[PDB]
Structure formats: structure tokens, C-alpha cells
Amino acid sequence: AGIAMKLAKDREAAEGLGSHERAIKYLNQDYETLRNECLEAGALFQDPAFPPVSHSLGFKELGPNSSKTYGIKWKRPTELLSNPQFIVDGATRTDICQGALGDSWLLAAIASLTLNETILHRVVPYGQSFQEGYAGIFHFQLWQFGEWVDVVVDDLLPTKDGKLVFVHSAQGNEFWSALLEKAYAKVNGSYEALSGGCTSEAFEDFTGGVTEWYDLQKAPSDLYQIILKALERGSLLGCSINITFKNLHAYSVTDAKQVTYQGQRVNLIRMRNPWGEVEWKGPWSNSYEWNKVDPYEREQLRVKMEDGEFWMSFRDFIREFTKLEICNLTPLKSRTLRNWNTTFYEGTWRRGSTAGGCRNYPATFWVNPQFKIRLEEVDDSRESGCSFLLALMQKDMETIGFAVYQVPRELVHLKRDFFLANASRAQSEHFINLREVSNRIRLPPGEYIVVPSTFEPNKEGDFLLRFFSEKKAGTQELDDQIQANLPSKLAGDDMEISVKELQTILNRTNGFSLESCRSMVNLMDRNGKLGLVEFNILWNRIRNYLTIFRKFDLDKSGSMSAYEMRMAIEAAGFKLPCQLHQVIVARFADDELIIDFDNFVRCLVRLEILFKIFKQLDPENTGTIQLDLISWLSFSVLMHYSNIFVQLAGDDMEVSATELMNILNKHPDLKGFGIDTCRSMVAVMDSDTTGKLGFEEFKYLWNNIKKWQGIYTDRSGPGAFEAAGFHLNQHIYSETGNMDFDNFISCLVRLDAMFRAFRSLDKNGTGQIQVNIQEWLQLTMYS
Secondary structure, X not given: OOOHHHHHHXXXXXXXXXXXXXXXXHHHOOHHHHHHHHHOOXXXXXXXXXXXXXXXXXXXXXXXXXXXXXXXXXXXXXXXXXXXXXXXXOOOOOOOXXXXXXXXXXXXXXXXHHOOHHHHHOOXXXXXXXXXXXXXXXXXXXXXXXXXXXXXXEOOEOEEOOEEOOOOOOOOOEOHHHHHHHHHHHHHOOOHHHOOOOXXXXXXXXXXXXXXXXXXXXOOOOHHHHHHHHHOOOOEEEEEOOOOOOOOOOOEEEEEEEOOOOOOOOEXXXXXXXXXXXXXXXXXXXXXXXXXXXXXXXXXXXXXXXXXXXXXXXXXXXXXXXXXXXXXXXXXXXXXXXXXXXXXXXXXXXXXXXXXXXXXXXXXXXXOOEEEEXXXXXXXXXXXXXXXXXXXXXXXXXXXXXXEEEOOOOOOOOOHHHXXXXXXXXXXXXXXXXXXXXXXXXXXXXXXXXXXXXXXXXXXXXXXXEEEEOOOEEEEEEOOOOEEOOOOOOOOOOOOOOOOOOOOOOOOOOOOOHHHHHXXXXXXXXXXXXXXXXXXXXXXXHHHHHHHHHHHOOOOOOOOEHHHXXXXXXXXXXXXXXXXXXXXXXXXXXXXXXXXXXXXXXXXXXXXXXXXXXXXXXXXXXXXXXXXXXXXXXXXXXXXXXXXXXXXXXXXXXXXXXXXXXXXXXXXXXXXXXXXXXXXXXXXXXXXXXXXXXXXXXXXXXXXXXXXXXXXXXXXXXXXXXHHOOOOOOOOOOOOOOOOHHHHHHHHHHHXXXXXXXXXXXXXXXXXXEEEHHHXXXXXXXX
16 A cells, blocks of 8 residues: 555566466456365355346446346356357357347457457467366456456356347357456446447457557558558458448458459458358459459469458448457567567656646646657658557546657657647647547657647546557657755754754744654754754755745745646756656645645655665665665555445545545544644555545545554553554654654554555565665655
């Protein structure tokens, strides 16, 4: 909880988890184990997570009451098929068929899956039956925002009259698809969840590929050579007509062919209806044809297929409105045609740091992250190649789009200067209000920079940008290296000595505060007391800093836009990656995305103390550093959807330090609580880097305060610690014996936090964790 249950997915992830080879366990349920726990108990499985109740079916228009949805009676296939087939292929046609109270679109992804065998069990694994090893549980595998997930589900099915009122087989009763959708309907939420899907989306979710598209009649004068070049890579191309020729869902192009016919060109293209009927009144129209002058040679080359021949010519434009292609990731891995080189990058946009907006907001456009593309060899005339597809998905979503500029010669992190100064070469055609926006793009050989984002700023988001090219292309993140430069009336209570309370001396306006205080007190040296001789080395530290905040504070405001911290930080000496800039502002910045001299220096001071550690705990400079539990413990001390009940003004989550100091801090029994505190609790239990806390993560924190609350005073203002969870061995530390609720409760929150951090990281109970500057910066900063 925090960045640490977010540092682990990274380490895992970059180690397979998330791959088709290694899916993720949706809801932490497992098919084999479920299956056996059924097997060894006499029970058919019942899906706890996606219960066959009534909400699963939706929420309005199709969940509760809605006659639409009435009288549904959930049943299993084995409960209506003397001997069910889950799947039994080698099939040619497909008898598939929409929902009878289902929406057709999806039909078409599902059907276009059974033409390729290898693709289909990639989403539908072998091993399953309604006989051999039954039990009442099937699993599937789906692409979701770039990670592959193993989804299970139970064979129950939404029904009426004993007939399935969703997707299904028409004569031939098989049921694989009939459960694919269940599972699909499941990882979204409900079956309305999928009302107004989108075919393309489907497809990418049953393959982990990208879907490019064109307006056929509107087509690029290069459509035929894209059609080709995709086909020679096993891409999934299908074609659609949106409301003699075709008076009549799918049809896909499976092939493509240049024949000589009367001493000219002619380009044919070979289509196919997965549901088998040709119906196309002819073999090459009535017109231009098959058997007619057209030498078998340059005509055997045609005939090679079935259930959906058609061999239509490229005025396959006048018949057919669009054409979506799903180009595959290298793994049909088999020296089947050509490859498709690939690379993906997971990214985010946060308020007041990386969420810049587009170019047309030059004040920010430059804080969006960056990603460099390097195009070397050119395509196999538009002059010289070096082409690629660029696709940018967002994990009532936001308008997104992108644009791509060309590197000056730098073979880091382009500042604002760069973009008010150079021109955009390539960009997405429009910005849009929908999942993933992509375009094909052709550019000379060069090093280009690529900048994704939303249209307006301050819209927070996660995205996956992707690159697929016909020829090898280097790709990487474009960001900065963790950089840090330098690798009197003391009113003493006796001699040398000045404890903290320095918040006296270092004071219109507010100043310092015991936490800045204490951190500056800490840089000092490792009692708690400073003195008058090295409160010199310090003084200037401040005034220097002070000479900074002013540079961005013209308007003597106090304040300072988060957006610009990045450059301040760097004035001061530190150069950190966008991720680190994103932690800075989620912890110190305010709700207007401002930062004042206090929250200013602190973070500047902090960072100063953390390098200094990482610089000590590592002599032989090897990049990493060493923490067993016992150090860690210190060093880590210096107008829709009810879902799931809060009180939250119709805004789903959104608890901020602000909201978190408006509730807690609210009677006799001695309950103050403060922004600072509040702030820091929020970090630690946030693992999103948004500055806020979710329903679950507020739930987990709340049940402790509420349990910690009686925790043990003799109706006044004790290791109530072990008493609570934490049994401690050695120490304790910071009037007489105090600790008050404000401290006690907030103490119990960081000890709990950092203890969980520990485990997460040190998953094999090895007993010591270990991390580079980066994962170490993340953790101590953010808190």
C-alpha cells in the first residue's frame, strides 16, 4: 500500500508477470485450485466474485427491475444439453449468433477468432470440457491495458425458456463463446458494462494487438500496399459496411493478389465470411472474370480456400464502408511471413506535474512525458520509408491525442524552449474522446521524440503508448537521470546545543515548521541539537533556497506553481525523472497546484538527506543499498453508480489530505489532526501517485483508526503498540510521558505502512530488502 505495492508489480512485471505466458490471476482466483476444491468436495463451482445474482446483468436498462431483464433464469449447459460441448473445433463456418437480448458488435470479434486456431486457444486454453474433469468452471485469457489476465468463470448462463439470451451456437449447440463473453462481461463489471462495446476494442482485448482503421471510400492511395504488408504478417483484417453488389457483420480479407488481365494491372483481394455463405454473385464481380481470358496460371494462384472464397477486385471500395486491421505482436511466432517489431511504455499524467496538455498550452505541453523513436532503415513512391504505427491507449474518459517532433542532434528531458522553437512533424489526426488513438506515420530516417497527452491540462490518467513498425526501430523513455550536485544569538539552554524549536529563531507570513525544522535539524548531524556554528552552513542553505523560490515568485505571492517546481528543483541542483516529480507534488503541493517556501524547502531538504544516505550506505558505489527490517524501521523514520457508502460529494473517490483532515479531526474523551499529518497518511496509503485515497484504501485506513482508537489513559490525555499489532523490541522516543491521539494514531499508520513495505519488497522473507536510488527515492520522498 503506497508506492511499495507498486514497486513490486514493477519488479514482477518486468519479470514476466503480465505476459501472455504469465497472465495475471483476476481477483486472485485460480481455475485449477478452484476446480479441485470442487472436485474434492462434490460441488459445482459457483462464481463468488461475479455471482449469478441480478446485478451482474447490469444496473439500469438491464440490471434491476427493467422488464427488459426479467424472468432470467441462470442455468448451466449440462442442465439443458444431453451431453454439452464446450468447444470442439476443426470447424469451418461458425453458427455463432448475437445475443437474443444481446448487442451484435461483439459477435463479430468472437466470430473472427475461429478462422485462426492459434489465436483463439490463446484466449481459449485447451484442456476443458463438460465431461472429462468437469466441475463447473472455465477459464479465459484477455488483454487488459497491456497486461494479460487469467479470468475464470462458472458455466452458469443468463437464460429464458431454456434458451441462452446471449451469444451462442445456432443449430450446433457448443458453448465456448457462450462463456468467453461471460468472462468478458465479467472483467468489465456487468453485461451492460458492454452494451456499446466496439469491435475493435474486443479484438485487441482477444489478442493484445492494435487496431488501425480506414474510410475505404476515402482511402489512402496506399491502402493496397498497407493491405498487403499487413497480410504478410498475419494481421487480422476485417471489413464492414455501415448503414446487384452487396445488398447483404463480418467478412474479413484473408488474401491478396495481383493478376494480369488483358495486359494490365488489376489488384484482387480475397474476402471471407466466417459464417460461410458466399452469396457474392460471382468470382471476380457478372463483370471482369474467373474463367474468362485469364490463364489458369495467373488464376490457380486464385482458387485456395473455403467457407468464404470471394476473390473480388480492389473496387472492393464501392461494396464495404470500412476496414479495421489488427496487427499482432510478434508471439503466431513461427517463421510465418514477416514479424512487426514492438515496444510499449506504461505512463501517467498527474495534476501539477506531467499533465501538461497539448501543444496548444505551451505553458505546460512540455511537462508531459517524452519517448524517443529512432527510424533507421526505410520501408520497402512516397520516397524513403521509415514508417511506423503509434498508438496511445488510456487505461467518460479523457480526450487524447499525441504529437511527434524531431530530435536536434542529442543522441535529455526537452524543456519548454524546445517546443516554442521547433515544428511538429507527424501527429495524431485529431484528438479524441475514446480509448486508444493511433495513426500510421511515415518519416525520414531520423531520431524523433514523441509526446502523448490529453488535449487540456490537468487531466490525470494512465496510458500505454505503443510502437509497431515494419523495420527495426529503437524506442526508449525520454527523461532526465537522477542527478544531485556536491555528491547570531543561539539563545542556548546550555553551551553548544539548539534542539529544534528553531522555528522561533528562523522567524505578513508563515514560517518554517517543526517538520522542516526537524528535517533541517537532521541534515545537521547523526540527541537533536544543532548549535550556533553550523547553524551557519545551514543559514545560507536557506537564503540560497530563498534566492530560488523568488525567481519563480515575481509576483511576491508566497506561492509557486507546482508545474515549475521541476525547474526550481534543478536550480537547486537536483535532476529527477518525471516519476519523482510526480511524487514531489503529490506530497508538498497544495490543491491549486501551488507550493510555498515551507513545503518548498522541506522537500528540497529531504531530498538532500536521502541522497546523503544512499550515498553513505553505499561505499563501492554499486548502485544499490542494503536494509534489513531493523534499519528500515528507522531510516523510514530519518451522476451515476452507488458501487461496492461514504459521504463523498458525487465524486467516486477523492479523499485528499484535505478531505482527510475534515473528518478525523471531528468528541469529549479527548477526540488536533492537521494538514501535514493528513498529508502523510495520504501518501502512504496511496499507491497511485494521485495525492488522494480510494474507497478500499480509505476503508483499510479507517478501520484501523477506528480499531486503534481505544488503544492501551485513566480518563485523562504503555506499549499499546504490541497491544495493537506491533510488538517492538528495543527503543521508543519522540512534557512527561505524553503521546496524544494525534501522534498515536499517526504513528500507528506509518509503522504499519512501512512494515507492509517491507514485506511487499522482501516477498521471500529473505530478511533484507534492497533498492537503487530510484526505488529508494520514490519510497522515502513519498510520505
